[PDB]
């Protein structure tokens, strides 16, 4: 009576489910890409020269006075 009903709801959910070492040992190599414009000397000289010439909670709590 009630504890039984809950056990029964639970049982109705069912039962779940159901080691190896790396056999193929597949390996991947990484490349780095070229980033165009990343170097400062790829910017026009003219525009290079142009460019180169209470703790917080208390403060907020205070907004709510």
């Amino acid at each position: 009576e009630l504890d039984d009903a809950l056990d029964e709801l639970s049982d109705s959910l069912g039962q779940r489910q159901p080691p190896l070492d790396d056999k193929v040992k597949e390996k991947i190599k990484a490349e780095h890409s070229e980033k165009l414009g990343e170097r400062d000397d790829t910017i026009p000289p003219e525009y290079r020269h142009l460019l180169d010439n209470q703790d917080p909670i208390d403060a907020l709590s205070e907004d709510l006075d």
Partner: protein, 174 residues
């Protein structure tokens, strides 16, 4: 009027490295802040609630609140907190079903008996009394859906028409 420059330095300290307040951080900010205010009774902001707040403010789809998003949310909370205190006329720290209409009205949500009753059913568990966190949560949502309507009613007819995609995209936030 540079409450603005002071609030910018304020946001930078709580936002941390990414310069954005996440749901987790916002949960921490809000819980710590309402700890100070015993008349703003609440069982806490959960991550569930805070994530919902971030979702609906998340204009740029970063998953966190940037300055402008936090500022808007905060200013709403600042306004709504005062509404809350004003219309807690029995000073119980919560908003009852009799206190609710006058408080949603003052926030700019002028509903009817039926709507208020459905709000009280959906957002009040405490015998028709609404916590500070449920209250903020509900108004954030109302505000979001209000903005959504205004934006979709561009001709200003008082009528929107949505397909299934925009319908689910707007309503699944709330």
């Amino acid at each position: 009027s540079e409450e603005e420059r002071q609030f910018r330095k304020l946001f930078v300290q709580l936002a941390g490295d990414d310069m954005e307040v996440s749901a987790t951080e916002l949960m921490n900010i809000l819980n710590k802040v309402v700890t100070r205010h015993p008349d703003l009774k609440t069982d806490g902001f959960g991550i569930d609630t805070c994530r919902s707040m971030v979702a609906v403010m998340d204009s740029d789809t970063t998953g966190k609140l940037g300055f402008e998003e936090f500022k808007y949310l905060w200013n709403n909370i600042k306004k709504w907190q005062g509404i809350y205190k004003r219309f807690d006329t029995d000073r119980s720290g919560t908003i009852g079903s009799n206190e609710l209409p006058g408080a949603f009205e003052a926030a700019g949500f002028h509903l009817n008996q039926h709507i208020y009753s459905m709000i009280i059913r959906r957002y009040s568990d405490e015998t028709g009394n609404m916590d500070f966190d449920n209250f903020i949560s509900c108004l954030v949502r109302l505000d979001a859906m209000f903005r959504a309507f205004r934006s979709l009613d561009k001709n200003g007819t008082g009528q929107i028409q949505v397909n299934i995609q925009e319908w689910l995209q707007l309503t699944m936030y709330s």
